[PDB]
Amino acid sequence: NPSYQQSPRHFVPTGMHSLALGTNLVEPLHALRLDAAGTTQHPVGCAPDEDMTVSSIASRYGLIRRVQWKKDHAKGSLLLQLDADPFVEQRIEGTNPISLYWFAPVGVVSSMFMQWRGSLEYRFDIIASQFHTGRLIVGYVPGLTASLQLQMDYMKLKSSSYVVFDLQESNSFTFEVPYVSYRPWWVRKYGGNYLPSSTDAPSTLFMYVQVPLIPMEAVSDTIDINVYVRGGSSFEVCVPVQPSLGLNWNTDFILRNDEEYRAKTGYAPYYAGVWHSFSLVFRWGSASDQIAQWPTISVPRGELAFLRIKDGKQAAVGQPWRTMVVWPSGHGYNIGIPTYERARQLAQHLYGGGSLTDEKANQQGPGKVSNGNPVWEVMRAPL
Amino acid sequence: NPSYQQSPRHFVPTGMHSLALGTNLVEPLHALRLDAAGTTQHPVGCAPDEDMTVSSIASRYGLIRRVQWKKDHAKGSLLLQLDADPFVEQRIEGTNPISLYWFAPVGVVSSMFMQWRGSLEYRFDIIASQFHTGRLIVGYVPGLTASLQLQMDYMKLKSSSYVVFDLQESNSFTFEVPYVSYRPWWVRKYGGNYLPSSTDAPSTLFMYVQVPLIPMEAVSDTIDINVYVRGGSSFEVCVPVQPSLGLNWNTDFILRNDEEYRAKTGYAPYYAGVWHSFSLVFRWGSASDQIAQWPTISVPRGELAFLRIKDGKQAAVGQPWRTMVVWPSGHGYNIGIPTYERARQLAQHLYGGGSLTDEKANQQGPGKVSNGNPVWEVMRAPL
Amino acid sequence: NPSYQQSPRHFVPTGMHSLALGTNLVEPLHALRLDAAGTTQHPVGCAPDEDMTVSSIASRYGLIRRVQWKKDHAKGSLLLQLDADPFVEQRIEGTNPISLYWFAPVGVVSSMFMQWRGSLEYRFDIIASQFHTGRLIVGYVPGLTASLQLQMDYMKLKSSSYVVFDLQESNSFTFEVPYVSYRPWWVRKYGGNYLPSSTDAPSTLFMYVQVPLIPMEAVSDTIDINVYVRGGSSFEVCVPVQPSLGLNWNTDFILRNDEEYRAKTGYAPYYAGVWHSFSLVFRWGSASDQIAQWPTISVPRGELAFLRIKDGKQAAVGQPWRTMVVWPSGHGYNIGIPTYERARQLAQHLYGGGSLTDEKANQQGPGKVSNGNPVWEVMRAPL
Amino acid sequence: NPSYQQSPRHFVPTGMHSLALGTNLVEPLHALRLDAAGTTQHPVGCAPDEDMTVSSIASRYGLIRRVQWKKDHAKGSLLLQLDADPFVEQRIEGTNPISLYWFAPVGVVSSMFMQWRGSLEYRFDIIASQFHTGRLIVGYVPGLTASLQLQMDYMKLKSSSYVVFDLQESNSFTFEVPYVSYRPWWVRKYGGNYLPSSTDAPSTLFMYVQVPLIPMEAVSDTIDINVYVRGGSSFEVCVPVQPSLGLNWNTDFILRNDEEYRAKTGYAPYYAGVWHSFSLVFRWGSASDQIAQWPTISVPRGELAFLRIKDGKQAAVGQPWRTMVVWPSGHGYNIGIPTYERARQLAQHLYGGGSLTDEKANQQGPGKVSNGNPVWEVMRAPL
Amino acid sequence: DKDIDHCMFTFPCLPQGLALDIGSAGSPHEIFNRCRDGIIPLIASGYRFYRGDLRYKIVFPSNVNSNIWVQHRPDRRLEGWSAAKIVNCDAVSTGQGVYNHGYASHIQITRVNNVIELEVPFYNATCYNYLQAFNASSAASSYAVSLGEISVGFQ
Amino acid sequence: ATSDDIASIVNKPVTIYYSIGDGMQFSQWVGYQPMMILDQLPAPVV
């Protein structure tokens, strides 16, 4: 035993490693493996064919638009005016209360990032035989705000960058949309559920009809044009933020309007139980001072309110407790008193100027808790 | 004293080293040895003869089946249809309420692991003289579910892999069971006490009688066939999970049915004692607010229940306290009130709509605690 | 300021370094020295002459037996039958209630260790002139249990290892006792104060009289034989456990019989003081809820007990408080109520079925605490 | 992110670096500097001229004695008998209640250390003209205890080490006092304020008159002799302990006699305030249960005591609260009750056998705290 | 009433697993009731002798703060498979029930970390120790089952 | 914890995180499904 008498280190504790960092950083853990050098391995048929990579996800065409190009379109008719961002939109005509949406892979991989830059690539597949002859401008106006989105024609389009395509035999072309902005990157269109920081596109992509469609009398008068979007060779995204998109795997959404009434957060499930400082009262736990607290009901001056639950099956069951009188206990919070009319008379006593200690347990029984935090309906009556 | 002014380290604390990791990992400890470099040593006669190793435990034949092969078996009679997994079974015909079981060493060493793969090896010792002549198929059907387990014969067996053995002089052979599955490994048959994740064998091993036994008139008409199981040369197991087997060293098992009554977990042993907020009451400790809590008895509406212990010797002894009335004290839990008929009248008062504080210590004495958590019988009576 | 963004270490805290380890281990400390490299030094006359070492302490003869060898001893008379372990015994004929004992240095250095092995060495100094002639066996029986300890003679001794010594001129010899056991080590004879794990010696050393003493008529008929014990050249001890020996520096021993009464551990010294939940009561501290707790007196049914201290000088002094009534306060513990006959009447009230709150401070004064935890005598009287 | 799965370190925390260690030890800190490598620097005129060092402080003569050597001294008269330790003494004849003292620099630098050793050096400056002729012994007796300090003369001095000096022309000499002890070091004379561990000097320095002074009729009959002390070339001190000396920068000393009365430590300053468990009472804080506690007054049996402060300006001011009745509140401590005669009648009630709750806030006001912990006078009166 | 020296509980230290405590018939320990015996005595069930050390990692409650001592006592013989289990210690009659001096100990501070991690060495005078369940035929055979007898006590 | 310390546990939050740990290799490219845009979700009208 040599005695070590030199001065020791002098650190800072922290509770947790970094959640943000993910590249150049040996992250220590507690592996639930049996070997300390063990790492999952990929044999010759379990091999990763796809490198997960933004420039390999964004480099995939996704169908985004179906354009009806008929014979009776004039020499200036608009076919599409979609925006020159990766968030090109195709909405599903469904019956859900929140509308689902189709995105190109460049849009989904660009929705997790704050900023993007670079050229896009639109592939137009003009589905025609070799006997349809047409010609169409696919142009690009740098910097159109929404007020200048109208007052367009193909003649204003020809002053900017544009591409005139001759539909004679080859019936597909890729217009590579330029990236012209004042900004090296460009902030995402939608953002999280946050109405500011919602920036429209740098520029707009148009597609007019330069020379109208001239179909033969044996082929059809109409032609579908498919429009595909790909992140180009120069497309790139940088800052990882909250995705602006959600999956369709669970499209249920809960509107939190304040008109309905419930217990406070963390005080549910609750059951009818006795309490020594107060007769039954709704308790969220078995220890003392664990009464379920309740919000204050906005009762106007000169009236009163008792309660009745919307669903008696979700209520706490001693009879299932469907009526309740919410009133301050004096300990700084509102208790919910289960009642048997009696709730109306108790609201007449309390809101009329009485107290709990004025003269004006056996029903506990099994003590079934409520089904989570059930919604309580506020019944209101004049005093 | 140079002053060290550089910035110090910035860690994470954790309370404990890894329980899971066991190979490539220098595990620091607090040795109760006197030397810090000391390690237990094995002299020349204390040497380890057996390397503990799955491929040395599984490479040992264990007797698993005794087959009665008589003269009057026909040319298709089944002798065994055991499964082609290491969990081949031989049950003991005992009188215990839980049945013990014999396993091969491949079965016990394979029961601690989630998955297994590889060939098995069955050694058939056909105990015969050189004057018994017989012949038997030992076949192997890959992939039989339990509904296809019936409708077998030896003719369906010959369409799969099979081995025909000629019993003339040499009277032992090893059929090495193939490993044919769709899966590189194979999930264990039994698992822990958990009825899903219980996967039957990849395949089934059969043994029919190809040519019936022809014994001479001086030798016996019957022959025993011993069947031994070994993990083959290619047998291997991987993921260590809860063993599906237990030892016979303590075959006692406690059924936890909810019909009997006892104190809550952690509130026993308990003794009769006074308490200031409540007369005697059962306490699990000497400090204040250490009353033994009790579960709520499922008393239906219109009846009552008092208590009487099944064994008065395990009860708390002040007289040994064999009767008790469980009722909420108001502090969020049920107290157990020791009584002297008096329990019946107190249950008539409490369940009839009374209280504890209604008008309707000297018996404490030694304060002997109960024998652990004794089982209380719920006596029920109408109100 | 470069920002250090790599992940930091991930340890385990422990409160203390090892108490057990003592050899190959740099033990860090907080030195109360002024120099961090300073170590106590040994100049040329402060030098350590004795290396502290078991093989240098055990290699020292200690006198252990004085043997009276007379002329009238026959040719088979036993002189000593001491055991062949280092714990050879010489008891002091003293008047102390616990008997002190002399040990050889091999016995004291072997009493701190669990196990020992190796040869012992007994030096026999047969104190004689050159005119005493004698001859004596010093033999050694391997493996005598206590039932075979009797039925010995020198003829059974000659079947085992033995040494016959000729007392003619040289009058001292060393019999080196062999180590014959079934065990490479040998567990200590006595152990701590623990009656199992008390293992008798491997073997027994005897010393008979082969040829009786033939003294001349001018020299004495009697001879003393001193018997010295040394750990031999092969003697060695291993595992450090609790020593089986204590010093004579403080031979006081306190018998903890349960018949006398005192306060609980940690609640003494105590003084008479007021308490708000209860009049005086014995308190062990100045803060609230610091009442001295008392054990429950085993009072049989139908009787009572008050208290009277054995020594009024050790009592708490307000008058010195020599009488007290121990009774449960209701807070889960027994308080000790100081009384002025009044203790007898209060015990008649409490054990007769009363309470503390039934109708049936100025004496506090200086508040002298008791002399430690004084012993209280339980006076018992019929109810 | 490589996962770091090896086992981490296993330390001990301590709250603080070493206070004791000061040499070979890099002490980490939190510098309030802006540069982490910055150290205070000493330019060419800010240079340290004096190395702080015991052998440079102790190597400085300090005047310690002024000796009056007259003509009428005989041939054996003692001039000084000061001790041969660095703590040679010159007391100031001042009017302070604690006497200040002059020390040589060897005494002050040797007062911070436990032990010292080595030769001292006394410089005797015999202030004379060249016409004074004298001769004096400066001797040295090794090992004189205080009982042998008397019965000295110069003839007993000549048996030990001595030096005879001839005052003719050169009138200064240095007697280098030997270090003769049985001990390599020597424990300090005074120590901290602790009357044991106060060890007198190893030896004593004497100075007699060998040949008496023979002055001429034109020069004076008297001569002053200055005596200077220096730690010699071999003087050295070792163990740093509490200094036996204090500065004169604050010579105020507070005698803590127990006759006066005050509040307990930590319960002052206090003000008159209300308290819910008790009317005004002295509180040391604003939170509840922060009553100023008071010591128990040693009131004999049959009398009483109220209080009156010695200085009403230091008292708590509501009127300035100069009277108070100290009595146990029941919560284990003594409260101080402010009174308006009323203190005498309340002491008649409490010490006469009453209580606080017997029948026998508006004066709070500003709530000025007391000036620290003011001294309270105990007025005593018969019951 | 426990003193500072009194051991709170003890257990003989052996790789065979303890005498398996299902629990009382009312309140069973649900792991040893339902998940019978675990892995290490399932492998040590298949062998006869062992020679080696053991590790322990005792985990303490977090409501307690008190300093905890841990003794290894290799002196102790194991008298049969009955009482080869964890013994909540009663009042002290011998030196079994207290903290002892010479035996190897360690003190975990519960306020820093409530887990003490051990390495209990092979301090037997044997070649190797017994590994199945143990009926104590020979009187010295009982010195050869457990590595020792660890006692944990609160201060 | 036993059933006396189980009351401090009741209705306390436990949050779980996850990342993919350096061996994760997503293999077969399958296009995305219909997405929902988040800032078109309705605001909680007062």
Structural class of the secondary elements of chain E? mainly beta
**Cα end-to-end separation of chain A:** 85 Å
Say how many strands of chain E there are.
11
What portion of the residues of chain A fall into strands of 2 or more residues? 25-35%
Number of helices of chain A: 4
Reading the helices and strands of chain A in chain order gives EEHEEEHEEEHEEEEEEEEEEEEEHE
Helix count of chain E equals 2
By helix and strand content of chain A, what is the structural category?
Answer: mainly beta
- Please indicate the count of domains of chain E: 1
What would you call the quaternary organization? part of a larger assembly
Principal-axis shape of chain E equals globular
Concise synopsis of the structure shown:
This is part of a larger assembly, with four copies of chain A (383 residues) and two copies of chain E. Chain A is mainly β and 383 residues long. Chain A has helices at residues 54-57, 105-109, 154-157, 342-350; strands at residues 3-4, 27-28, 62-69, 90-91, 100-102, 115-117, 120-126, 133-142, 161-167, 172-177, 186-187, 203-207, 211-214, 223-231, 236-237, 245-246, 271-274, 280-283, 303-309, 323-328, 334-338, 376-382.
Structure, explained:
- Chain A has 4 helices and 22 strands.
- Chain A has 383 residues and is mainly beta.
- Chain A has 2 domains: 251 residues, no CATH class; 132 residues, no CATH class.
- In chain A, the strands form 6 sheets. Chain A has a 4-stranded antiparallel beta sheet, with no helix packed on it. In chain A, strands 8, 9, 12 and 13 form a 4-stranded antiparallel beta sheet that branches.
- The two termini of chain E are 13 Å apart.
- In chain E, the strands form 4 sheets. In chain E, strands 6-1-11-5-7 form a 5-stranded antiparallel beta sheet, with no helix packed on it. A two-stranded antiparallel ribbon of chain E has the order 2-10.
- Chain E is 6% helix and 24% strand.
- Chain E has one domain.
- The chains are: A mainly beta (383), E mainly beta (155).
- The interface between B and E is large, with 49 and 47 residues.
- Strand 2 of chain B pairs parallel with strand 9 of chain E, so a sheet runs across the interface.
- Chain E: It is found in: Virion.
- Chain E: This is Genome polyprotein.
- Chains A, B, C, D: This is Genome polyprotein.
